Amino acid sequence: EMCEIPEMDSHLVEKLGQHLLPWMDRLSLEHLNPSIYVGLRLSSLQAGTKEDLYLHSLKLGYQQCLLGCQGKPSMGQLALYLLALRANCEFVRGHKGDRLVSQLKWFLEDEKRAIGHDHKGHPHTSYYQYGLGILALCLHQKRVHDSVVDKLLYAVEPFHQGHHSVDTAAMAGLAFTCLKRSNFNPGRRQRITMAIRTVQEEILKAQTPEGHFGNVYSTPLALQFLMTSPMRGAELGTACLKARVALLASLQDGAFQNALMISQLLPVLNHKTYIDLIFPDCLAPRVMLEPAAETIPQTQEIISVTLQVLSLLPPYRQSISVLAGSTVEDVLKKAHELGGFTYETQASLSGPYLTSVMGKAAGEREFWQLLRDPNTPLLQGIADYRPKDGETIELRLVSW
Amino acid sequence: SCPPTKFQCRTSGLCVPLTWRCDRDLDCSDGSDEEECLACLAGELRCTLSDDCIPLTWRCDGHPDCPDSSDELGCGTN
Ligand code: CNC
Ligand SMILES: [Ca+2]
Ligand SMILES: [Ca+2]
Ligand SMILES: [Ca+2]
Ligand SMILES: [Ca+2]
């Protein structure tokens, strides 16, 4: 059976795109987002001339910062920039292009070395970024050595060490699919074929009773991967229809606010995936997005949220009053204003990432986890999760 | 129609840095920007005309990782 997601309501799709639209005018390097560009080009929606300026800004920023900048882009982000080039039917080229390719190849080589011949060491970033890097190079018909592919193969193959999310497995599966379709790494062809099936099975076995694969925000990338190949013996069609039901409910309940998440979902709703960047169709008609004329406004209600940090001595626990509809980040700002609380964030393609709390920065294989009561990890970051009145938000330094 | 310390793409108003003016790359859609013109680690190999080291596995992989492309030269091999 095949993984098919029947077209959703055009109105519903349009309002998703309108969430992306304001970002088209935010061209500062801290806000530039190659995933947004890619998601839009693969969608049924377009931003017209704004897109061309956006790509131009991407090319200026990424090439000047990495070859010649305030907090220049990461290698993982460089990989997504490569996807953005494919989305405009370009191959990375010229002397500047060649150098960018080799920088991404160095990233993979360093992660391979960090992982080790034994496969105990972690990558310095994630296996998600490792897969993303292989995919990005493959989409531009750039080859990586079998030894590089081997680390991704071992990570998903039987008796592998560690546990990977649905997102990570899906990204790996996409990388494997590009290698297979391109007939790259022929000395790993059978293992690559087997790994794709392995990822299929693990993703299907991660489907919740609601219908999501892992969770609501893993479902988009999971669907992208599942759409790329048949799955004989399995009921892929049924699983994907159940996911659509789950996806539809989540959409109608306002689950998708984050621009990166929308950019990963929009291709699915247009029956496209990142694998369509092998043979891109850049001139396919797309509906022009117009700004949602919209009176947003304004709450009159005050809510109180308890903010707590038990990972530090002495511990922090305070009730914070904010306007209803405020984010966790607003709570953090208010806590800082009241005195006795500090924190730090850094920019990412998903928005502000919490890196430090009350002077304590997360170290290697550590992060500040966001939770609500009771002991329940948030599915959104500080700038997207909007706590309800009486909620308790915890920041917890954890190791993974 | 926009600042100094920087060259402009003539045929479509997009504006680009001067490090790209006459640099063999087609950065402008029209191509105007080109017209008025140490030890190596084990398992690595040195690029013939420079200081650079690359992994041995980048030899003959279809992409010039060396500035002089020496890693892709004797690559019609057996
Ligand atoms: C790896 C990973 C993943 N994560 Co995290 C998970 N699990 N994540 C990160 C890890 C980063 C560290 C590392 N060494 O890689 C990890 C485990 C620590 C992290 C943290 C969690 N993650 C979380 C979620 C919910 C997000 N994460 C994802 C991006 C989920 C991702 C899956 C996905 N579908 O995208 C994910 C698989 C891949 C991200 C990536 O590398 N993209 C490629 C990269 C090139 O882009 P980038 O923007 O430069 O990557 C940076 C950011 O993604 C930042 N970051 C990671 N997660 C988030 C989440 C938010 C909300 C923000 C603003 C930034 C981040 O870390 C990366 C830098 O290394 C997201 C889809 C995952 C999911 N399916 O649930 C989701 C995000 C959902 C959404 N509505 O936006 C947490 C909030 C969980 C929690 N309750 O604490 C938390 C972030 C808290 C904080 N301190 O701000
Ligand atoms: Ca969201
Ligand atoms: Ca520590
Ligand atoms: Ca040039
Ligand atoms: Ca080479």
Residue numbers in the entry:
A (entry chain A): 1 to 68, 78 to 409
B (entry chain C): 53 to 89, 130 to 170
How does the study describe this entry?
Mammals depend on dietary uptake of Cobalamin (Cbl), which is a cofactor of at least two enzymes that are part of essential biochemical pathways. CD320 is a member of the Low-density Lipoprotein Receptor (LDLR) family, a large group of mostly multi-ligand receptors involved in cholesterol uptake and other physiologically essential functions. CD320 features an N-terminal, extracellular fragment comprising two LDLR type A (LDLR-A) domains separated by an epidermal growth factor (EGF) homology domain, the exact function of which has so far not been determined. While the majority of related LDLR domain-containing receptors bind multiple and distinct ligands, CD320 has been reported to bind TC with high specificity and affinity as evidenced by the lack of interference in TC binding from related LDLR ligands like LDL and RAP as well as high affinity for TC of both the full-length receptor and its soluble ectodomain81318.
Various CD320 truncations were generated and tested and a final crystallization construct comprising residues 53–199 of the extracellular domain of CD320 and TC residues 1–409 was chosen for structure determination. The TC-CD320 co-crystal structure, phased by molecular replacement using Cbl-bound TC as a search model, was refined to 2.1 Å resolution and revealed a 1:1 complex of TC-CD320. Whereas clear electron density was observed for LDLR-A1 residues 53–89 and LDLR-A2 residues 129-171, no density was observed for the EGF-like domain (residues 90–128). In agreement with epitope mapping studies, both LDLR-A1 and LDLR-A2 of CD320 exclusively interact with the α domain of TC. The structure of CD320-bound TC is very similar to that of its free state20 (r.m.s.d of all Cα atoms of 0.43Å) with a few key differences. The interface of TC and CD320 consists of ∼900 Å2 buried surface area, with LDLR-A2 contributing 486 Å2 compared with 405 Å2 for LDLR-A1. The fold of the LDLR-A domains of CD320 is similar to that of related family members. Both LDLR-A domains contain central Ca2+ ions bound by four conserved acidic residues and two backbone carbonyls in an octahedral coordination. In LDLR-A1, the Ca2+-coordinating carboxylate groups of Asp75 and Asp79 form salt bridges with Lys105 of TC, forming an ‘acidic necklace' previously found to be a key feature of LDLR/ligand complexes. The equivalent acidic necklace in LDLR-A2 is formed by Lys114 of TC and the Ca2+ coordinating carboxylate groups of Asp153 and Asp157 of CD320. LDLR-A1 contacts TC helices α3 and α5, whereas LDLR-A2 interacts with TC helix α5 and the loop between helices α6 and α7.
